Design an enzyme around this catalytic site. Structure first.
Site, PDB file in Angstrom:
ATOM      1  CE  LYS A 163      -4.176  -1.609   0.134  1.00  0.00           C
ATOM      2  NZ  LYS A 163      -5.227  -1.223  -0.854  1.00  0.00           N
ATOM      3  CG  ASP A 191      -4.070  -0.693  -4.058  1.00  0.00           C
ATOM      4  OD1 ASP A 191      -4.279   0.352  -4.718  1.00  0.00           O
ATOM      5  OD2 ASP A 191      -4.978  -1.341  -3.504  1.00  0.00           O
ATOM      6  CD  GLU A 218      -5.369  -2.946  -6.563  1.00  0.00           C
ATOM      7  OE1 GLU A 218      -4.429  -3.623  -6.097  1.00  0.00           O
ATOM      8  OE2 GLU A 218      -6.546  -3.060  -6.165  1.00  0.00           O
ATOM      9  CG  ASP A 243      -9.920  -1.564  -6.309  1.00  0.00           C
ATOM     10  OD1 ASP A 243     -11.174  -1.585  -6.371  1.00  0.00           O
ATOM     11  OD2 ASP A 243      -9.306  -1.956  -5.291  1.00  0.00           O
ATOM     12  CE  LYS A 267     -11.353  -4.177  -4.154  1.00  0.00           C
ATOM     13  NZ  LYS A 267     -10.876  -3.087  -3.281  1.00  0.00           N
TER      14      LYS A 267
HETATM   15  N1  LIG Z   1     -12.729   1.088   3.478  1.00  0.00           N
HETATM   16  C1  LIG Z   1     -12.682  -0.222   3.720  1.00  0.00           C
HETATM   17  N2  LIG Z   1     -13.443  -0.744   4.677  1.00  0.00           N
HETATM   18  N3  LIG Z   1     -11.882  -1.019   3.011  1.00  0.00           N
HETATM   19  C2  LIG Z   1     -10.994  -0.608   1.930  1.00  0.00           C
HETATM   20  C3  LIG Z   1     -10.111  -1.777   1.523  1.00  0.00           C
HETATM   21  C4  LIG Z   1      -9.142  -1.442   0.373  1.00  0.00           C
HETATM   22  C5  LIG Z   1      -9.098  -2.593  -0.686  1.00  0.00           C
HETATM   23  N4  LIG Z   1      -8.693  -3.865   0.002  1.00  0.00           N
HETATM   24  C6  LIG Z   1      -7.383  -4.276   0.324  1.00  0.00           C
HETATM   25  O1  LIG Z   1      -6.362  -3.634   0.079  1.00  0.00           O
HETATM   26  C7  LIG Z   1      -7.297  -5.618   1.034  1.00  0.00           C
HETATM   27  C8  LIG Z   1      -8.220  -6.721   0.503  1.00  0.00           C
HETATM   28  C9  LIG Z   1      -8.076  -8.049   1.293  1.00  0.00           C
HETATM   29  O2  LIG Z   1      -6.920  -8.592   1.295  1.00  0.00           O
HETATM   30  O3  LIG Z   1      -9.145  -8.449   1.859  1.00  0.00           O
HETATM   31  C10 LIG Z   1      -8.212  -2.210  -1.936  1.00  0.00           C
HETATM   32  O4  LIG Z   1      -7.891  -3.206  -2.661  1.00  0.00           O
HETATM   33  O5  LIG Z   1      -7.917  -0.987  -2.106  1.00  0.00           O
HETATM   34 MG   LIG Z   2      -7.287  -1.748  -4.501  1.00  0.00          MG
END
Ligand SMILES: N=C(N)NCCC[C@H](NC(=O)CCC(=O)O)C(=O)O
Ligand SMILES: [Mg+2]
Ligand SMILES: N=C(N)NCCC[C@H](NC(=O)CCC(=O)O)C(=O)O
Ligand SMILES: N=C(N)NCCC[C@H](NC(=O)CCC(=O)O)C(=O)O
Ligand SMILES: N=C(N)NCCC[C@H](NC(=O)CCC(=O)O)C(=O)O
Ligand SMILES: [Mg+2]
Ligand SMILES: [Mg+2]
Ligand SMILES: [Mg+2]
EC number: 5.1.1.-
Lengths: 369, 369, 369, 369
Positions: A163, A191, A218, A243, A267
């Site tokens: 991240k 990402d 990403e 995304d 998603k």
């Molecule tokens: N605001 C909330 N509640 N969530 C945001 C999650 C970000 C999302 N998931 C992740 O980065 C991790 C996905 C996982 O491994 O379950 C993205 O891809 O950017």
């Molecule tokens: Mg993402």
């Protein structure tokens, strides 16, 4: 089979460690749980984890949209008539994919239990035997990120998702640090969560990432700028994934038309559940766009639903649903085999809900009949 | 559940009257029937009616492709893992949608019987309650075509599909004759089956059809010329449907990219069965392209499969499967309620196969184990 | 001159060594031989080697399509009226290029014998004096591939075609190994046979091939994805060749429109024979697209037909027909002069058929009159 | 077989009546005849009728280009190696299609005589059995044009080509007059020979022609303006044919790319003879563009060559070679059956040259050895 009542639970899933991304930080994840009851006594569970920044839905708005707008018209309907249910929800209200997903997931869980089959078996059958699990590294100092990565490698992880998204210089330093630490055999994807804003900043950043063997970048630009993604794709050879820029078929059509990406992160919370997620997969397949089923970091309920979609489609080559691995409490019992995920053959979502845990995490609830 | 044996039957379905279209005439319809057996004793039926002119498959080539190429690798597989089965067939041989459909349909029939649910209930559930039935008028003298139309109106029909495609002047005369006969409240659509060849001839013909209230013009140019369809669409306000020009997702992608049509005729025999037909529906929906499920004029088996797809999708607004109404003998018992078609709730394809009729129509058969 | 009978022979050509490519492995090559007889006593030979993965035709389906669908309507026709014969075959059945090629080749062999002229002399005359022969290296460990290459160099070969297409990392290792072994003066081209699937994987691979002096990369993505080829071409300076993505004029039109390639691999089995192969050459020439006449690895019969086309056209700059060099038995006697191929001046295909060998390799046969 | 000498004859073919078109008037047609001799004693005849306004070639320039530039390098070459001969001529000089055609035609005449086969039999075989003959009406007062048309109808003609191109108002009056005279069953096509200059004038004219049942409008704008043809095509439903705008594959590529026409007028004098005319036909076929083989109004020699091409291709649906019907003297004896044209089975061009007539029409001649 008819829906007789829908219980709504506003809960909060506690995180072991703070989750930090470009546009926000999280100490826990607010979630709305749906308990769908039927005249035949079959019970289905659904879930909606709203990300305000992505779909314009909040924890509280989702609870109320479900209570006052979506669930009332569902009482009496057959959970298995999914095309019909989705049409009814869409004619009732535009968007609100997260609220719709909560309903959609519960319907499939019921359908699976009713037919005594896993959900994946109902949407194409088993295709994948397993998927590797990728650990998500929250934004932090390059040294801290590299340290956690080494620590997780000892835990068996071989794939990481970095991240980033604060400042190009710093983000590059973060990525360089982790790569140097883990060696070049460890898989790494990045990402930005819209952090680099535009093509100019993105392309400047990509110049310094060419020698780091990054699987893909990403969503580097703001969600609505599909044009920018296409422009970036025309001037780089690093794979690009969209995304936030992808929610429903509306964006997929545009992504396909403008050739804006190599991969897309599908998603359930962004498109409205299992059924629409499947439609997106079919659409991506037409254009030869590689798919991934990601998540908002959800409980075993939505996480399971996500895997059932992923395991049934050849076009879905990677998964990102690790909420059950990040929370200190979970209402479900989805089993993981880090560094891998495999689905059992239990009916429906194949999980048991601990109602004691559910109530414990509940802040407020209601029932619609 | 595992496939233990596949019976192949090369039959010929006798027509009450000759079926005449632009590129061919038919006295009977050669068909390949598939009888899929499983270790659990569940039996599924599939069918493949090959149109040489459309998919490059023949009655004899389909029988052998099934016997030597496709069925052998299927023994032992679970019929419910449809995504997997289709992937196996595609990795084994490119194209041959008709042969693949025969297998695909039998698998769904088995899945339905196993779960005690109609096939439509497994691919989205019930959406449509019924569809009007359109009578197909074979090519003939304008007076004969108008006469049969009046005769069928007395039978309850309110929608007609005119087959034309010999000579623009004559085709226009045919269409004018029928319209004058039936009045302006009767629905009429025109199918040229590639007869007008190019945009020039097509546009010349369309000039004379503007005042005839024609619902749509189907495939006026040669199948491979998608460019011509787009050009015609840019210079006319009559709805255009592509049939032969659409087979698999490859053409759909192009139709969508070039904005070549308003409607598309999806057929199980052109794309490989129920599963891929559904994917096409999802793809069309993305681009807002109206869909129809047509047919090659098949027995109750494939006809039923076609209806199950149509009844489960909002994007599919019309159907064209009347083989059971045209044949003097049928191995199945699909029930019609002219001028309408409605599906019952019987499991699988919801039809019973009269094995005495099957054997009677069989010219040659074999079994693969 | 009229066709009086057509003998069909289903044979199997034994390979000295297994032929291994991205989507399949071969121990022998099933082939259909055509023996066309005429009222004047002139005999012509044709051949059809079907590649299921490319044209949707199989050994058995081709035999039957020829027997029941294509040959019956040909009895009585003049073999020299090739435009007419092709029109008749196309109006009878769409596609099946391999079956059509078998007929087409026999007609030209007869035409050549009748006019006492080599086939190339009838389709433009002699243009080329010779072509270098390229050895095809089957997929294997990088060390094994490099070893066979060195071994073949000792045999006189100076041009190699590397088969790859399993995993980008491995494929790159294979290519690096061979190049290091043979030095930089040896010509090397790479054929992925669709193995890299999409532009993303392809472009990632191309990054590591820039310094290896590769003449061209052949079909890196899935056949139907012409868009991907165009995208790749917009971001690389390595020459790109389309093979499986090109069959008939339908694809050529698209390749030309989208500027999807620098070179195309024309094969008689993919387009329907000599006549249509020539039309493709003329079409490619218009767009300045370099052409090659490749093959499915055929006997001296189809191989000879391929050379006759190649030797008569300036736009065809390379050839890939080495079946006679790979088989342990051949029904024909096409002469090679490794590392070169030159055509003699004998009439027709300029080869003699050993009928004893033909019968020996025959599994089943029939005659149509 | 080797070319031993080439006789060049500068002749003038006398017209019965003045030929009048938009950019010029003709009392006779200057032509260059080629007499190709071979070591085997076979003699071939070719012809080049230059239209200064179309290809930049004149009667005198063609004679000298042939004498000093093209023929010298041909002595010793085999007439049957047509691809090679054309390559040699193209490497020697760019363009000059008329001069090249003269050579090309003689080579095919020789090839036909040598193999004892009609030329059409060598370029695809017989496809067409006959073609209707269209009478060309020279520009004149609307009343005179209508009068000649009625007069020719009495002669059996049922298809007319109206020459116009002076002033839109007048041209429209001319077309209206003829149509009223001949009734609406007589086929009429209009050739503007670039007279309307641009899309604006053309579209204004087309407004008044919609109700006249005109088969097609030929070259309304200046030759080089392909863009204008495309624009006009986007705003009209009358078929459009390009003539002067099409010479070689260079223009065909552009016509195809810009979708500038429905039909094209292929002429041996514009592309360099039979061989290149055939390549153009193949190119047009790819894009589904209907073809016609027209002419500059030539003797039986080139006229015959044109028919041989036309009769061998399905894509060529109409012919316009009536020079032998317009001249009072002809060096050849091509047989017509007004209102139809059918080709005999005589070898080569299938015509006999009256050398007494040839010498009589010769103004100057030479021989190259
Ligand atoms: N605001 C909330 N509640 N969530 C945001 C999650 C970000 C999302 N998931 C992740 O980065 C991790 C996905 C996982 O491994 O379950 C993205 O891809 O950017
Ligand atoms: Mg993402
Ligand atoms: N060659 C064979 N066997 N069949 C061709 C059928 C043509 C097809 N069906 C029809 O016109 C009637 C469909 C129905 O009503 O079942 C078309 O739409 O063009
Ligand atoms: N499935 C069968 N039977 N054949 C497939 C051959 C592959 C083909 N030919 C080759 O690679 C070698 C051509 C030669 O050298 O003859 C290709 O270019 O990919
Ligand atoms: N400048 C010379 N010498 N000739 C020009 C002929 C014009 C040409 N042919 C004609 O109109 C009549 C073709 C025939 O019927 O042969 C055109 O199509 O525009
Ligand atoms: Mg149709
Ligand atoms: Mg290849
Ligand atoms: Mg003209």
């Amino acid at each position: 089979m008819k829906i007789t009542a829908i219980h709504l639970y506003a809960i909060r899933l506690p995180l072991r460690n703070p989750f930090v991304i470009s546009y926000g930080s999280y100490s826990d994840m607010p979630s709305i749980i749906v308990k769908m009851e039927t005249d035949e006594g079959i019970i289905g569970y659904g879930e909606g984890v709203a990300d305000d920044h992505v779909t314009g839905e909040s924890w509280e708005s989702t609870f109320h949209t479900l209570k006052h707008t979506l669930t009332p018209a569902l009482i009496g309907q057959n959970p298995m008539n999914i095309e019909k249910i989705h049409d009814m929800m869409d004619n009732t209200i535009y968007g609100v994919p997260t609220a719709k997903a909560a309903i959609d997931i519960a319907c499939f869980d019921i359908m699976g239990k009713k037919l005594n089959q896993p959900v994946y078996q109902l949407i194409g059958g088993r295709y994948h035997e397993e998927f590797p699990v990728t650990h998500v590294l929250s934004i932090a100092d390059p040294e801290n990120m590299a340290e956690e990565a080494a620590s997780m490698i000892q835990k068996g992880y071989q794939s990481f998702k970095m991240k980033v998204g604060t400042n190009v210089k710093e983000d590059v330093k973060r990525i360089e640090a982790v790569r140097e630490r883990v060696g070049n055999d460890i898989a790494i994807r990045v990402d930005v969560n819209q952090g680099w804003k535009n093509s100019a900043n993105t392309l400047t950043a990509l110049r310094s990432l060419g020698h780091l063997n990054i699987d893909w970048i990403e969503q580097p630009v703001i969600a609505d700028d599909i044009d920018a993604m296409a422009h970036i794709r025309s001037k780089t050879d690093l794979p690009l994934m969209i995304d936030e820029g992808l929610k429903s078929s509306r964006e997929m059509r545009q992504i396909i038309k403008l050739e804006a990406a190599d991969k897309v992160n599908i998603k359930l919370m962004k498109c409205g559940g299992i059924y629409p997620a499947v439609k997106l997969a079919h659409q991506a397949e037409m254009a030869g766009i590689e798919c991934q089923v990601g998540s908002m970091v959800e409980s075993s309920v939505a996480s399971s639903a996500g895997f059932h979609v992923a395991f049934s489609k050849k076009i879905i080559t990677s998964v990102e649903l690790t909420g059950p691995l990040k929370f200190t409490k979970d209402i479900g019992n989805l089993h993981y085999d880090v560094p891998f995920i495999r689905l059992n053959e239990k009916p429906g979502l194949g999980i048991e809900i601990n109602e004691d845990t559910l109530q414990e995490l509940t802040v407020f609830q209601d029932i619609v009949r």
